[PDB]
Design an enzyme around this catalytic site. Structure first.
Site, PDB file in Angstrom:
ATOM      1  N   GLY A  34      -4.102  -9.669 -16.066  1.00 29.33           N
ATOM      2  CA  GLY A  34      -4.224  -9.985 -17.481  1.00 29.33           C
ATOM      3  C   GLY A  34      -5.675  -9.961 -17.892  1.00 29.33           C
ATOM      4  CD  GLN A  90     -10.826 -12.829 -19.179  1.00 27.42           C
ATOM      5  OE1 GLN A  90      -9.622 -12.687 -19.430  1.00 27.42           O
ATOM      6  NE2 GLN A  90     -11.309 -12.884 -17.917  1.00 27.42           N
ATOM      7  CB  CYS A  95     -10.299 -16.374 -13.660  1.00 27.15           C
ATOM      8  SG  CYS A  95     -10.858 -15.928 -15.355  1.00 27.15           S
ATOM      9  CG  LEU A  96      -9.585 -10.087 -13.807  1.00 23.40           C
ATOM     10  CD1 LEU A  96      -9.051  -9.009 -14.786  1.00 23.40           C
ATOM     11  CD2 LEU A  96      -9.822  -9.463 -12.437  1.00 23.40           C
ATOM     12  CG  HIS A 124      -5.433 -17.498 -16.968  1.00 22.05           C
ATOM     13  ND1 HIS A 124      -5.963 -18.143 -15.865  1.00 22.05           N
ATOM     14  CD2 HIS A 124      -6.315 -16.518 -17.291  1.00 22.05           C
ATOM     15  CE1 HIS A 124      -7.115 -17.575 -15.538  1.00 22.05           C
ATOM     16  NE2 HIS A 124      -7.352 -16.586 -16.386  1.00 22.05           N
ATOM     17  CD  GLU A 125      -5.048 -13.436 -19.088  1.00 22.43           C
ATOM     18  OE1 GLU A 125      -4.661 -13.241 -17.915  1.00 22.43           O
ATOM     19  OE2 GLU A 125      -6.259 -13.533 -19.407  1.00 22.43           O
ATOM     20  CG  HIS A 161      -9.706 -16.229 -20.706  1.00 26.54           C
ATOM     21  ND1 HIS A 161     -10.929 -16.593 -20.181  1.00 26.54           N
ATOM     22  CD2 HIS A 161      -8.957 -15.813 -19.657  1.00 26.54           C
ATOM     23  CE1 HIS A 161     -10.909 -16.431 -18.869  1.00 26.54           C
ATOM     24  NE2 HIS A 161      -9.724 -15.959 -18.524  1.00 26.54           N
TER      25      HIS A 161
END
Ligand SMILES: [Zn+2]
Length: 169
Positions: A48, A53, A94-95, A136-137, A140
């Protein structure tokens, strides 16, 4: 051959705490952002990505939790219109926090309303991994990284790890 991808910000970069604005019109520009975000997510690789981000502070998310990478979904101006009392714990990465994994507790089921790449409104019941990923997204887009749910001790140790990450050979 080089590839045109979007740069993914790393915690604790201050820009990851900016609140994204809603997308007013889903135009060709937004469809390109969806495209570039999906390419960037698949190349990282990850499952995702939130526009925040990549330093684009608009309410745009892409997600593909499938193993075959055949279930890409875009979410524009997503809204949690129902959340469950039931909670489940999941170990998240997490990226924007490479190499760091820790458990987070979240509602185990949500229903989300959002716009697709064609500006149409849709609703989705999310359970399991998808329920984790969408929350999660969406976190962000509100300027929240998952490590902020961890103890201050753990946040302090993660910040030190991120400084190591920049000096990797
Ligand atoms: Zn993330």
């Amino acid at each position: 051959k080089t590839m045109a991808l979007l740069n993914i910000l790393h915690y604790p970069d201050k820009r990851l705490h900016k609140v994204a604005k809603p997308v007013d019109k889903v135009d060709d520009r937004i469809r390109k952002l969806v495209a570039d975000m999906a390419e960037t997510m698949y190349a990282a690789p990850g499952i995702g990505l939130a526009a925040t981000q990549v330093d684009v502070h608009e309410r745009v998310i892409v997600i593909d939790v499938s193993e075959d990478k055949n279930e890409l979904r875009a979410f524009i101006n997503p809204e949690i219109i129902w959340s469950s009392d039931g909670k489940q714990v999941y170990e998240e990465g997490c990226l924007s926090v490479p190499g760091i994994y820790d458990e987070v507790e979240r509602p185990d089921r949500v229903r989300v309303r959002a716009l697709n790449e064609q500006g149409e409104t849709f609703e989705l019941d999310c359970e399991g991994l998808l329920a984790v990923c969408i929350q999660h997204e969406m976190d962000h887009l509100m300027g929240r990284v998952f490590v902020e749910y961890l103890s201050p001790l753990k946040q302090s140790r993660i910040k030190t790890k991120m400084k190591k990450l920049e000096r990797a050979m």
